[PDB]
RNA sequence: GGGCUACACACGUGCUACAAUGGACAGAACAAAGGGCAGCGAAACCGCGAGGUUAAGCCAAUCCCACAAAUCUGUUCUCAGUUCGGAUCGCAGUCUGCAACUCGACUGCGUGAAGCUGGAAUCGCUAGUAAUCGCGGAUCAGCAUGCCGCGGUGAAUACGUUCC
RNA sequence: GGUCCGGUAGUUCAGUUGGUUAGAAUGCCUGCCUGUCACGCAGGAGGUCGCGGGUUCGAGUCCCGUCCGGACCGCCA
RNA sequence: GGGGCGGUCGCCUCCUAAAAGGUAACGGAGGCGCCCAAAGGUUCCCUCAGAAUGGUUGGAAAUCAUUCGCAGAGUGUAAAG
RNA sequence: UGGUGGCGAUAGCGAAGAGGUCACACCCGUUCCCAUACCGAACACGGAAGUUAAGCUCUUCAGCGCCGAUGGUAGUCGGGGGUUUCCCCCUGUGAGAGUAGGACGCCGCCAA
């Protein structure tokens, strides 16, 4: 709840007198992040997708849910039936519990690793970032999982454009590329 | 919150070889971690680290 | 960037809906529920004429719950619904969940009207 | 996973474990071992829970994994840009030290296979 | 100045390995023969190393090249693309030479291919031979996995002329 | 002219019905065998399924059209 | 539109059929001798295809976030409605 | 101003201005009822700190969508005549399309 109370002290008067907002009141918030895993399955039989979903109780503690595929694909595996990748919503209180260990622990830890995310934001406002190791999450053991799993991250704000999407990130102590 | 499904959390403490603690919730009682945000080289300004990047380059090489 | 339809617009085609379920008019009025964020509105309107046969509110300056607007104290009002039809002989009155899911408090409020005397 | 050099296995003495690092070698292991007084110790993977920190410092004064990856990258591409005839020697196929290519060179030529035949 | 060193590939012939009878570290121990004055160059000192600084002695059964290596004795790794093997390449040095890009050798550091004994087929050798470990020389400014020698350790089998 | 059957490695034939996948002989290429060839031994490549569409998740396969190669009919005044 | 040969014989969709319906030809395009205990019943909820942008192993597409989407979707199987 | 109706986007999209003490909302909580192929987002419950920014309503706009004549032609009815794979005139019908124009709403009930 740290980060939590940071932003409703230290960040948001500095980002009003940024510019100008209408009504006082407003600024924008996150939302929603959503946690892909894909796995890729190679080929459909994993056997068991269940065990990567179980690797995502880890990383939040919201539990995965398997996204069953909507469409066929002559390319690979499957008919609707037999769900690819896992996602997850967590929200309230849970939403800065979890991107307060992304900052302070799970970027810095990758190894080649700087800062990213320059082109990346829609011009709207959602960032998006992806994930590629398990180790990138302290409360993963490195004795589970073995072979790795990939991961991604959806930061949601409720500003209406990407330039103060972008400086409300900032804030945040989010890492940049620059 | 579905009962059983999702694993209880207690207040977690964050911990790093630097001494910097960080005070969160987690499944663990306790958290130790090799790597922090206040240790790591780039989020801690622009520390020399182990890079001065750039020497030398392009061109340097002279001995009298 | 998000911009989620408001809780409102979205009940009136979960409301609408249910409105062919049942006609509702036969000389038989209807029993219409509004859950306002503060309190639940109530009101009877029957077709073709739309007059509106009774009516009754959280918000009067009769009666005082005095918390207003929560639990069981919702049932004095939807009693007082009743006894407003009652002075009319009103009725059997059809009841209207809107898009609103049935259970409770606005359940409560249907639950008292049955103790009221209303063939429901 | 690791406090130093990334991704240090486990059951294996300190020295052999560190050598596994993308800059440690050998001898380097011996040196920075010669600045630890550790004297092998310890087999598994228990070292101290401060000299681990201590050690991790000094090897932290060393440098570094995918960033010494990008050296030799940068170096290489500094090699090809330049004009050149080393970094041509290095996408011909063709091995750069210098040593013919008549016979044997299969490092960079792969193995299969053949196309010629007379008469 | 190049090229004789080409490069998609084939073949001939060597070298190094694919490892626990082993690897790595430490200690200890046994040679022969050959070369050396436009040379061998000790010892002392500097550099992690290669070598450098300086310089005794030796025309040599005197002195120098020069330390033998396998081995033995212990410590350690405990069966794996590995503390197996070293390829390839990067960086930084070094010897020779007016001069090391093509196209030299060596060293330090870093990178750690392939290969876990090899199809069809084929070669050598009857004892100090095969097996294997080091050393020297001719060549030679520099460049020897080739060649010519030196010694260490040191077997198995030969029923026999059916067959090639 | 009218129906029916086929078109797939260089060549000659399987695989088609059973819908998610292409094999065999020979030939070709490589290394051996012999002082020379063949033969023999040990390895290796090579077909996009005649073409043009459709159906389906996906077509050598199923459904059509078309271009070819064959096999039957083309009769009665 | 002589017979023989070929093809066809029943049911279902559209057009030809001419703004009720009907309506012929060896007329023009297609399907069916099924399928499903659920894809049925009821109740409570939800809205598609495709596009653009951002993204790990994700490439023209498996997955996910977003503006756009009066339906360019889906409606067991084939067409109309 | 809120709730709930009837009239065929003349009720709409879009753009620019306005509002809130009460009312309507976002918003604040997850101990309870209920919850979520998971999730207090939604769905349920109980709270008034913050404001109209959005939603909600008012005031403007013909850029788009919509409504839509009058008048003409196409077609055609009952007829007739030729140069008849069709064409021409008489009688009664009358489109489309475009334009003039209309329009960013009215009519109700209940509650304050």
Redesign the interface.
């Known amino acids: 709840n740290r980060l939590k109370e940071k932003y409703n002290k230290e960040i948001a008067p500095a980002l009003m007198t940024k510019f100008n907002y209408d009504s006082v009141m407003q600024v924008p918030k996150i939302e929603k992040i959503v946690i892909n895993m894909g796995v890729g399955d190679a080929v459909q039989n994993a056997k068991a997708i269940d065990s990567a979903v179980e690797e995502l109780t880890f990383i939040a503690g919201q539990k995965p849910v398997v996204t069953r595929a909507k469409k066929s694909i002559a390319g690979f595996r499957l008919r609707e039936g037999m769900p690819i990748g896992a996602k997850v919503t967590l929200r309230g209180e849970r939403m800065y519990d979890f991107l307060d260990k992304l900052i302070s622990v799970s970027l810095p830890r990758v190894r080649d690793f700087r800062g990213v995310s320059k082109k990346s934001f829609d011009g709207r406002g959602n960032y998006t970032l992806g994930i590629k190791e398990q180790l990138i999450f302290p409360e993963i053991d490195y004795d589970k999982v073995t072979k790795v799993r990939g991961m991604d991250i959806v930061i949601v704000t409720t500003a209406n454009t990407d330039e103060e999407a972008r400086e409300l990130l900032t804030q945040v102590g989010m890492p940049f590329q620059k | 919150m579905?009962a059983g499904?999702?694993?209880n959390?207690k207040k977690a403490t964050?911990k790093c070889?630097c001494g910097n603690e960080?005070?969160?919730?987690?499944?663990?009682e306790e958290?130790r971690?090799?790597?922090?945000?206040?240790?790591?080289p780039?989020?801690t300004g622009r520390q020399k680290?182990?890079?001065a990047d750039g020497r030398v380059?392009?061109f340097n090489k002279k001995y009298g | 960037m998000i911009t989620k339809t408001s809780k409102n617009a979205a009940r009136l085609k979960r409301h609408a809906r249910v409105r062919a379920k049942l006609s509702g008019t036969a000389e038989r009025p209807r029993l219409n529920v509004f859950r306002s964020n503060k309190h639940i509105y109530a009101q009877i309107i029957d077709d073709v004429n739309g007059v509106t046969l009774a009516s009754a509110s959280t918000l009067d300056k009769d009666l005082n719950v005095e918390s207003t607007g929560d639990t069981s104290a919702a049932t004095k009002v939807g009693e007082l619904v009743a006894k407003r039809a009652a002075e009319k002989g009103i009725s059997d009155v059809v009841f209207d969940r809107g898009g609103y899911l049935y259970h409770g408090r606005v359940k409560a409020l249907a639950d008292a009207a049955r103790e009221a005397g209303l063939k429901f | 996973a690791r406090i130093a050099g990334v991704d240090i296995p486990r059951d294996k003495r300190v020295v052999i474990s560190l050598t596994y690092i993308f800059g440690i070698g050998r001898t380097t292991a011996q040196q920075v071992l010669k600045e630890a007084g550790v004297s092998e110790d310890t087999r598994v993977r228990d070292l101290t829970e401060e000299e681990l920190g201590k050690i991790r410092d000094i090897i932290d004064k060393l440098k570094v994994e995918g960033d010494l990856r990008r050296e030799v990258s940068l170096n290489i591409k500094r090699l090809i840009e330049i004009g050149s005839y080393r970094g041509i020697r290095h996408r011909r196929g063709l091995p750069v030290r210098g040593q013919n290519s008549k016979n044997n060179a299969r490092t960079r030529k792969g193995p299969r296979r053949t196309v010629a035949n007379k008469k």
């Open positions: 579905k499904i999702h694993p959390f964050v070889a960080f005070e969160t919730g987690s499944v663990k958290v971690v090799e790597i922090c945000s206040e240790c790591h780039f989020y680290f182990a890079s380059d392009r």
